Structures are given as structure tokens and as C-alpha cells.
Design a protein around this ligand. Structure first.
Ligand SMILES: OC[C@H]1O[C@H](O[C@H]2[C@H](O)[C@@H](O)[C@@H](O)O[C@@H]2CO)[C@H](O)[C@@H](O)[C@@H]1O
Ligand SMILES: [Zn+2]
Ligand SMILES: [Zn+2]
Length: 432
């Protein structure tokens, strides 16, 4: 990062060229150059490189990853005034609150929908259970009923959750990280339905994002499951399509995990005030979100003035219908382990490497695995009386060290007076 310029990371399936146009308008008005990048695996790279000080000023991702980033000390607290907060829907702010603090700007609400080819399939199925017979009919015409990305558990989750699968039990404003619901009867029933689709040759286990997108956009399969970002490529294609409610399973709505695309400010950025200018006054405007949306649709945007108009598009209305049948993702740090566990389980079950029951039993254990965290005490570093110690403290707590190594490193870098009288050490003693 350099002072006086902004670097932004956003995923490659989003409207990064539109976002670059917002960056050009920012540069035109203010002189600040904005560089938009879309690295591979950016949600994993960010915590890796925010440790070498080689991260972006601003990172975009769904809000579920941001609690972990914030817990690890990678994100700055944002400071929107009340008048700006009133411009966005309250529930979008809720998704970017962590430990009582706002840690990112909400951009847009994402939910998966059922996307279908009206020429192949004028009436889409209401139920998952009728898809096998639909596929049989379409196969006689040289087509298939449904293709979607089986390599990312985001896309299979709506089916896993339909009959009662869940990530973490939510009990009175709190998620219980030891109560994981990926191995209950409903999760098993949904994943078994998927595996049976594959066993019966109505889908194949290797289908990924590119294969499913190609197939739908070239008229080869009647349906796909995807989010708003995908509509742009379908529009460019020759396909007459609709976007509608996901099929039910066992008479229950499919329950997608709802993401809020969010923009966080790197805690290590020397440009936090510039990033705030850009996000509040350029991106989160009608004209800024339109520039991104026109490139790849955002979904249901967090900005009320724009969303009130945008929701008139039936595809956005359907996005919110599916969102209301699902659940907003937790943002707790355990979400990374949850997603990795379910990803392995879906892939292993779909490929036949494991049974559904064996895969999900391992997933429950892996998702609930406790993890040793020093960064619980990062707030104590801000009670340091000098900046050198403050920063030494932060590096030590973010360092994967043992408790002994943390204490010892703090003595080396942050002893300026007797420990019992130092607010940093008083905090660490009470906390760690
Ligand atoms: O598959 C696990 C994955 O799901 C979500 O990622 C979504 C993302 O929210 C969408 O905006 C779009 O990019 O598709 C992704 C799935 O490939 C979670 O947000 C993510 O943390 C999680 O790893
Ligand atoms: Zn292609
Ligand atoms: Zn093809």
C-alpha cells in the first residue's frame, strides 16, 4: 500500500470493470488513483498477505468472512455518521457488525435462485423431487435438467438446509460453536438427494462453476443455480431465461445462506480516510452502484434509493424471495472452518469416496474443532501508552505463537514500567 493511492481487491465473478469506472471518477474528482484487482482465492490470500503488509487498502467479499478478519485484527473499524447509516437498510449494517463494531460497508444482498431456460422448460419445477423425471424427459431431447457448481458448498447448502441442516445453533443472540448441524437428519437427507441425482445420472460429480455456466448459457441444460452476478453472461447469450424460487425439498423451502457483499478497510492501510471517501461518497451512491451493477448485477443493493427502483426487476425480486426463505450467514470466525468442512463432505460424498453419513460425520467434527486464539486479546494492544509497543503487541498476538512466546515477546517489546501498573498488562492479565 502507498499513501495517496487505493488498491481494491474484489472477486473475479463480480463487476470489477464497473468498480474500476467508479475508481476513475474518484480519481477525476480527487486526484487519488484507484487500482482494482481480482486475484485468485483472494479470501484466503488477504489474511496471508495482510501479515506481510502486502494487502489491499479495501477488500470486498461476502460478510461471512469478515468476522474472522476483524477478530484477527486485519480490519479497521469504520466510522459512518448516522446520516450515512440511514441511507442503507438496517439489516445490511447488522451483517457487518462484529463484537459491537461496524467492520465493513455493506454493498448488496446476495442469494442463490433457480435460473431456468423458458424455451426448454416453460414451467420450472416446484420441487427437487420432480427433477429426476424432468431430466429423463429432457435427456430424450438430448438435454439435461440441471447443472450447478458442486465444488463450492455455497451452491448445495440450500438443499442441505432445506430439511433442517444448519451451521451453528443460534440461541438468544449467540451462535454456539460446539453445536454444529451439518450431520443431522435434514443435512443427511439433502446431501443424499444430491448424491442420488449423481448415482442416477441426472448430474455428474465433477460439475463446477465454468461447466455449469457454459451449459446453461449455451442452451444445453434447462436449469442452473446461481447468483445475481451470473445474469450478465446469460444476458449476452441467446437464452430466454427466468429467475425464480428454488425448488422445495420434502415440502420445505430451500434455504440459501445469504451473503452481504461488503467492503472492508485494511487495518494496515495508510489510506483509511481516502477509502472512506471512496466507499461512502462514490461507491455507495446510485451512480456508483449502477456502474458496478451494469457490469455484473449486484443483487439487492444496500442503498435504499437505488434498491427501491432496482427491485422492480423480477430477477432482483426473486433474489429477495429466496433470501427471505434462507438465513443470513453468521460472520463468526468459525465460518472458515465450517465452509472448508462442508466443502470436503460434499465433494467426497458426490464422488463416492465416502458415504453421506461418513462425510458429514467428519464435517461436524471438523467444523466444531476448537481453535487456540491469542487475537481474543488484541484489544489490549490499544491500551499501550506508546506506538512502538502497540504495533509490537499486535504482531505478537497475530503470530501463531504459544502463550509463553506471547508473554515473552510482550516483555521484550512492551515493558515500559512495572507490569502490575501498565494498562496493557492489566488488560492482558484479565483477558488472556
Ligand atoms: O462455497 C463456500 C463459500 O460460499 C460463499 O462464497 C460465495 C460468495 O458469497 C458469492 O458472492 C460468490 O462469490 O460465490 C461464492 C461461492 O463460490 C461464502 O461467502 C464463502 O466465504 C465460502 O467460502
Ligand atoms: Zn464458453
Ligand atoms: Zn457446450
Amino acid at each position: 500500500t502507498e499513501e495517496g493511492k487505493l488498491v481494491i481487491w474484489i472477486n473475479g465473478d463480480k463487476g470489477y470493470n464497473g468498480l474500476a469506472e467508479v475508481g476513475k471518477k474518484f480519481e477525476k474528482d480527487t486526484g487519488i488513483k484507484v487500482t482494482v484487482e481480482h486475484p485468485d482465492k483472494l479470501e484466503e490470500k488477504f489474511p496471508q498477505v495482510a501479515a506481510t503488509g502486502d494487502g489491499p487498502d479495501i477488500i470486498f467479499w461476502a460478510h461471512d468472512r469478515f468476522g474472522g478478519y476483524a477478530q484477527s485484527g486485519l480490519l479497521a473499524e469504520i466510522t459512518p455518521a448516522a446520516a450515512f447509516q440511514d441511507k442503507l437498510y438496517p439489516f445490511t449494517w447488522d451483517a457487518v457488525r462484529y463484537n459491537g463494531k461496524l467492520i465493513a460497508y455493506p454493498i448488496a444482498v446476495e442469494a442463490l435462485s433457480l435460473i431456468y431456460n423458458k424455451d426448454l422448460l416453460p414451467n420450472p419445477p416446484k420441487t427437487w423431487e420432480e427433477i429426476p423425471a424432468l431430466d429423463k424427459e429432457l435427456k430424450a431431447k438430448g438435454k439435461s435438467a440441471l447443472m450447478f457448481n458442486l465444488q463450492e458448498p455455497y451452491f448445495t447448502w440450500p438443499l442441505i438446509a432445506a430439511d433442517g441442516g444448519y451451521a451453528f445453533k443460534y440461541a438468544a443472540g449467540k451462535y454456539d460453536i460446539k453445536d454444529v448441524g451439518v450431520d443431522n437428519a435434514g443435512a443427511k437427507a439433502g446431501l443424499t438427494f444430491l448424491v442420488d441425482l449423481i448415482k442416477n445420472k441426472h448430474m455428474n460429480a465433477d460439475t463446477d462453476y465454468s461447466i455449469a455456466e457454459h451449459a446453461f448459457n449455451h442452451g444445453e441444460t434447462a436449469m442452473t443455480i446461481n447468483g445475481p452476478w451470473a445474469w450478465s453472461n446469460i444476458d449476452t447469450s441467446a437464452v430466454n431465461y427466468g429467475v425464480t424460487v428454488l425448488p422445495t425439498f420434502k415440502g420445505q423451502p430451500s434455504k440459501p445462506f445469504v451473503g452481504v457483499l461488503s467492503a472492508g478497510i485494511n487495518a494496515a492501510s495508510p489510506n483509511k480516510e481516502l477509502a472512506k471517501e471512496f466507499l461512502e461518497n462514490y461507491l455507495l451512491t446510485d451512480e456508483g452502484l449502477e456502474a458496478v451493477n451494469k457490469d455484473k448485477p449486484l443483487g439487492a443493493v444496500a442503498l435504499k434509493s437505488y434498491e427501491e427502483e432496482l427491485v422492480k426487476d423480477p430477477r432482483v425480486a426473486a433474489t429477495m424471495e429466496n433470501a427471505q426463505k434462507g438465513e443470513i450467514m453468521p460472520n463468526i470466525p468459525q465460518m472458515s472452518a465450517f465452509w472448508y468442512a462442508v466443502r470436503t463432505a460434499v465433494i467426497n460424498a458426490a464422488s463416492g469416496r465416502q458415504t453421506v453419513d461418513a462425510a458429514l460425520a467428519a464435517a461436524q467434527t471438523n467444523a466444531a474443532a476448537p481453535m487456540r486464539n491469542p487475537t481474543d486479546s488484541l484489544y489490549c494492544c490499544d491500551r499501550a501508552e506508546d506506538h512502538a509497543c502497540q504495533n509490537a503487541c499486535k504482531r505478537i498476538l497475530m503470530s501463531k505463537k504459544t502463550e509463553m512466546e506471547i508473554v515473552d515477546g510482550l516483555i521484550e517489546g512492551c515493558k515500559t514500567q512495572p507490569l502490575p501498573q501498565d494498562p496493557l498488562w492489566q488488560c492482558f492479565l484479565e483477558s488472556s
